Amino acid sequence: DHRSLKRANLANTSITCNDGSHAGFYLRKHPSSKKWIVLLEGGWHCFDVRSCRSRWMRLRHLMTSSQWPETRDVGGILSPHPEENPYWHNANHVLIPYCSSDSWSGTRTSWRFMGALILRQVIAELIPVGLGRVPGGELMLVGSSAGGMGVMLNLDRIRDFLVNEKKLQITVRGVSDSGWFLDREPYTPAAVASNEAVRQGWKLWQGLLPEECTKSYPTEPWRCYYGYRLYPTLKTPLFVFQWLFDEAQMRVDNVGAPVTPQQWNYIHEMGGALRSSLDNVSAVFAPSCIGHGVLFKRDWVNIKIDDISLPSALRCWEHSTRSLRLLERCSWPQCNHSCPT
């Protein structure tokens, strides 16, 4: 199955990207495997008129399906080559592009925000094509950045859809890559407070949050857009990959391109808060490197912690969750021999 992933459409035509164009996915069916990797594409999001207008001027393709090619190649965990994907090269592979600008949480029908609806529809569409058709199947829902949040917000819903409504005999797991953000004091004041944007997003998107998390923040459910608040109520196994000096957290923290020691020291502390915010997490791989995203990259085999590579840690976690904390032990940017480029 070395061939590319192939575009497919959704039956329910009322499920749409931001601009009204139809959504869908890419598929590479494997002739015999019962394992599925479903990868949610990432980006950022837009939460009001100005930001959405601007995203439509600066990033049209993430709000519409018109520019989409008929096929996609994706490396890392959706690669069909064993050198690049030593444990999942022979599974069924699905890519869901991100055209809803809502961290895969929207249910609203100048724009539409159907993220959570898109995801539930794609999963519905995979059943007739073999997903959990045979007992002993497995679904790994994985995503990067906003895709990471997409996974955490829907993972419990999807397991409960498939194991309970649909009564399939399937093990369901999630992986969030680089989607674990913090609400903290920025380096310099920015136009809007982190928490106010999340609140507007929730309302604009009509965001569908998980109930067990919503119960623990009943005054303000939008808190569940943060990894570290979502996680303690999450029941389905979730593997968290996080660059301890993540670039997207730096943009959020409004640090600018670091050329001063005050900026670099703010970054050093930003890694320490990230690290601590992962205190609770049972399965985690967090190297002290500058970066954003990893699961889709050919380099994903190369990053190690204590000589344990990411695919190898992920494989071990799969083994032991058929029914694992690796944080870098030095604390400064680029102290890992194997940091990328």
Side-chain angles (χ1 to χ4, degrees), residues 1-109 111-323 325-341:
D1 63 338
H2 80 278
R3 76 184 193 279
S4 297
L5 297 135
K6 183 62 195 78
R7 177 172 189 167
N9 282 286
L10 309 174
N12 185 338
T13 318
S14 60
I15 306 179
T16 326
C17 296
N18 284 141
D19 76 354
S21 69
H22 317 278
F25 60 110
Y26 296 80
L27 178 66
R28 174 206 280 116
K29 181 78 191 91
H30 189 267
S32 64
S33 173
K34 312 155 156 188
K35 319 187 112 208
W36 294 72
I37 313 303
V38 171
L39 182 145
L40 273 41
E41 220 173 53
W44 192 233
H45 46 75
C46 75
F47 56 88
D48 69 351
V49 60
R50 189 179 302 164
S51 70
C52 288
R53 187 148 302 166
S54 169
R55 177 189 190 72
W56 175 260
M57 292 303 290
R58 287 161 171 158
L59 294 175
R60 291 164 178 281
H61 63 282
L62 302 190
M63 307 183 63
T64 185
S65 69
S66 65
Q67 264 34 86
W68 289 356
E70 273 302 303
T71 60
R72 297 269 327 244
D73 300 299
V74 171
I77 199 165
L78 293 202
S79 165
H81 311 131
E83 321 92 29
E84 175 164 27
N85 187 0
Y87 304 110
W88 300 280
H89 71 274
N90 57 4
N92 299 286
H93 295 126
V94 178
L95 174 75
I96 318 179
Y98 176 54
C99 65
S100 60
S101 301
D102 56 8
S103 288
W104 300 92
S105 73
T107 62
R108 169 177 305 286
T109 74
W111 310 111
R112 318 198 184 188
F113 302 103
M114 318 207 200
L117 299 169
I118 296 186
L119 180 56
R120 198 220 323 177
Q121 181 67 16
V122 172
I123 298 305
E125 297 262 327
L126 301 180
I127 294 153
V129 63
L131 169 72
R133 171 101 46 64
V134 193
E138 280 174 54
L139 169 79
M140 211 191 272
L141 196 63
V142 313
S144 312
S145 64
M149 275 297 105
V151 171
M152 306 193 222
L153 299 163
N154 303 114
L155 180 64
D156 278 349
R157 296 211 161 80
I158 288 164
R159 178 219 252 162
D160 172 59
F161 177 61
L162 292 168
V163 178
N164 296 329
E165 312 308 334
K166 288 290 184 176
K167 259 97 194 173
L168 307 171
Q169 259 161 292
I170 187 145
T171 307
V172 180
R173 290 178 267 234
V175 179
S176 160
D177 152 18
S178 308
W180 190 275
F181 294 91
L182 299 188
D183 42 10
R184 55 192 285 275
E185 191 56 42
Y187 173 78
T188 304
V192 177
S194 157
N195 290 17
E196 305 307 339
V198 325
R199 200 179 38 67
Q200 292 160 41
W202 168 52
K203 295 227 181 177
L204 179 60
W205 308 328
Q206 299 196 319
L208 178 46
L209 304 170
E211 284 181 332
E212 214 70 34
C213 181
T214 274
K215 283 218 299 303
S216 43
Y217 299 89
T219 167
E220 58 204 2
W222 53 264
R223 293 280 173 179
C224 300
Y225 281 102
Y226 298 92
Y228 70 100
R229 296 195 182 279
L230 207 49
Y231 180 89
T233 32
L234 187 71
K235 293 190 178 187
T236 313
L238 180 81
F239 185 106
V240 171
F241 172 89
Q242 195 64 29
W243 295 119
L244 286 175
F245 303 100
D246 178 276
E247 307 184 83
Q249 191 58 63
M250 295 178 204
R251 292 174 227 122
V252 168
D253 288 350
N254 197 24
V255 182
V259 301
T260 61
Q262 49 258 50
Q263 283 169 299
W264 277 111
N265 273 58
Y266 179 99
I267 289 166
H268 185 84
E269 283 144 355
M270 177 215 71
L274 276 172
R275 172 186 294 269
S276 297
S277 72
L278 300 166
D279 283 336
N280 276 323
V281 183
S282 141
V284 46
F285 192 97
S288 74
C289 303
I290 291 156
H292 191 57
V294 77
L295 295 182
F296 48 97
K297 296 178 184 180
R298 177 153 278 168
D299 331 353
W300 92 306
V301 293
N302 295 335
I303 188 70
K304 333 198 142 177
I305 305 194
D306 302 321
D307 280 322
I308 298 165
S309 79
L310 175 56
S312 174
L314 199 50
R315 183 56 149 197
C316 293
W317 165 79
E318 201 178 29
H319 292 351
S320 69
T321 55
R322 69 199 186 283
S323 196
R325 283 171 61 75
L326 279 168
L327 291 94
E328 193 82 80
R329 293 197 270 115
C330 52
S331 264
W332 65 89
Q334 311 305 113
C335 64
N336 190 301
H337 213 241
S338 77
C339 288
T341 86

